[PDB]
Design a protein around this nucleic acid. Sequence first.
DNA 1: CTTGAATG
DNA 2: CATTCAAG
DNA 3: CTTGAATG
DNA 4: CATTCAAG
Lengths: 255, 255
Amino acid sequence: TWLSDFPQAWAETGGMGLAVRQAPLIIPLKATSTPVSIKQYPMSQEARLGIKPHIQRLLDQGILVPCQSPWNTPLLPVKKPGTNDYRPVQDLREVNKRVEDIHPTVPNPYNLLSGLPPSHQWYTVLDLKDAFFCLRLHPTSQPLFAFEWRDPEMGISGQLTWTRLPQGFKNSPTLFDEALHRDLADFRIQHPDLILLQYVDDLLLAATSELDCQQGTRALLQTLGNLGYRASAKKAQICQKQVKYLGYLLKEGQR
Amino acid sequence: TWLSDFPQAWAETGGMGLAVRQAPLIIPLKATSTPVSIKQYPMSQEARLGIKPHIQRLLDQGILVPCQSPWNTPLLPVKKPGTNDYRPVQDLREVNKRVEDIHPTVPNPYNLLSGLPPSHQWYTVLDLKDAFFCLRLHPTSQPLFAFEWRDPEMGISGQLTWTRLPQGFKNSPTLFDEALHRDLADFRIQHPDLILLQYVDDLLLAATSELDCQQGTRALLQTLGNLGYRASAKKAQICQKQVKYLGYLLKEGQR
DNA sequence: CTTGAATG
DNA sequence: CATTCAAG
DNA sequence: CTTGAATG
DNA sequence: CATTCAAG
Ligand SMILES: N=C(N)c1ccc(Oc2ccc(-c3nc4cc(C(=N)N)ccc4[nH]3)cc2)cc1
Ligand SMILES: N=C(N)c1ccc(Oc2ccc(-c3nc4cc(C(=N)N)ccc4[nH]3)cc2)cc1
């Protein structure tokens, strides 16, 4: 009943996250960058109706807010199964090109897994839901990610932008990984015997026994919830001898 | 009047050459080679009539002879200006593939020219006419180069082959260059002060003065004629301060 | 004419 | 993968 | 829909 | 140089 013991740590019961200890992120531009405003290609009504619910939800959550900005990038309608199930995908390539590069600090899965001792075979895998959205963007950097939004007949003035780290931004994975490392530094210190692997929003906790794993998981969930992050209860793999992590199947200490 | 003083050395007056000091060449095949007989693609009457005179001339010269061989490669009709001026071109690629490779001993023009001292600025350039044809092919190797020949209505039985080193054969340049080097070895020894460069059928004689060049040229022409080779009187550049050799313009010792 | 390599 | 070039 | 890279 | 893939 981990779902009930840690209501705040799960996406299904704690609501949208917000990393309260992390200062709003400022995104430095390259020395010669000037705003670029790309025209929004006309979107069919089908695509707009498919996207609308997502946009409204983000607006209600305060993740998207109205704005007037010199920057503008196109929104794209992306589906998968049939001509249904849409979801907003912003093409931030022209923005990415104008943002100063940062060093890629996220380890590749292969090297990350090398830090898992055979002594720790009790695993717990958690994936953080809407991880990037948990990190606030400083108001000065918000205008950079603006896009146009029109309702199938009459909607908001013109542009909308993100108040949190957006999908499609080249530095989101690295900035998120670095932010969570800062937030989980104390947890690591308070649990010397535990092994914690972080790959952006995918976490692997390893303990020597089933007890230390349940104790560790309880503490990690409590810490994450308190910090403002949210894990997927649905996909969560708690205290298992075998788990799926980063495309690998961890079993008998293999891999 | 070099044309009259050396009748035997010029192609225009000495007739078709024949390297009398060189033993008929035997062409070794690769260890696993077996004869290949490629069908002759039908040739238009236009092409056949264009080729016929050349074939008859070679037959009269004994350069081509009738034969029955397990080997056969295609003859091609090649023209240049208009739909006129034809000339037989044999595709010996399938034969080349089955012949043992030999080391490429012909120097590249750049390196060959490095052996020309500034002290020798009186040049003479001669190109040997139908050079390969001057080298006999041993009867055992003649069948290898056979091709089919049909007259525009009624001609020779079937196949014809070469009795001399043929054009299109991968080793002809090297074998010719090596043969002429053997034949001109004594000339080099008898004329220590002369510079002689050989690039297959293109010869460059260099002397310190105009006299040594005329003396040297006279001796070279006499030697070549006696050996059975023939130079082009038309293209000959005798005792000049400036000459064209291997695409270069030799002048003032430059190049 | 058929082959291979070099370009679009 | 379709054309162009080069070559025998 | 637009971009670049990878394939034919 | 025309298609296909991948991605934002
Ligand atoms: N698809 C198309 N419309 C086109 C595709 C390619 C085009 O141009 C060219 C095609 C081929 C060459 C070219 N091909 C070769 C082959 C060589 C060899 N291997 N002997 C040696 C040198 C050489 N140059 C040069 C230019 C023109 C049009
Ligand atoms: N001209 C034609 N008829 C055809 C030409 C090419 C064909 O196939 C293919 C085309 C393209 C790919 C292919 N393209 C990419 C791009 C990648 C990237 N840069 N992100 C990463 C991986 C990748 N695989 C794989 C196969 C099929 C037909």
